[PDB]
């Protein structure tokens, strides 16, 4: 991936034009690189959202509301 990107950024120095196969290979390598570094942050609760009475928010828990921070 790094080599293909560097070749794409250096081709203009020698006054050349990339072939479609080179572009496809670079695209596939970059897609693999992006796949390897996904996040999907999985957003949390709100912060004033109530916690149901079935959770036993006094005997077993000290929080009556979701913290939703830090």
């Amino acid at each position: 991936a790094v080599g293909y990107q560097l070749l794409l950024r250096m081709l203009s120095d020698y006054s050349l034009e990339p072939t479609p196969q080179v572009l496809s290979n670079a695209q596939r390598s970059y897609d693999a690189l992006m796949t390897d570094t996904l996040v999907v942050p999985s957003m949390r609760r709100r912060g004033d959202f109530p916690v149901g009475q079935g959770n036993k928010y006094d005997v077993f828990t000290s929080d009556r509301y979701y913290p939703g921070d830090l």
């Binding site: 006094d58 005997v59 077993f60 828990t61 000290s62």
Partner: protein, 52 residues
């Protein structure tokens, strides 16, 4: 002579002798209410308290 050891049976009573013991002093003295109902195994493994 008489050899009648087969007329009796070895008996082990159903009694247990007294054992040794320890005492609970430090556990009773320290406070347990402050941490009670605060930390759970699933939720985490550390809790924090704010200093004055």
């Amino acid at each position: 002579p008489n050899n009648l050891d087969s007329n009796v049976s070895q008996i082990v009573l159903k009694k247990f002798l007294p054992g040794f013991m320890s005492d609970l002093v430090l556990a009773k003295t320290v406070d347990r209410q402050l941490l009670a109902g605060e930390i759970n195994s699933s939720t985490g493994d550390s809790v924090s308290f704010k200093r004055p």
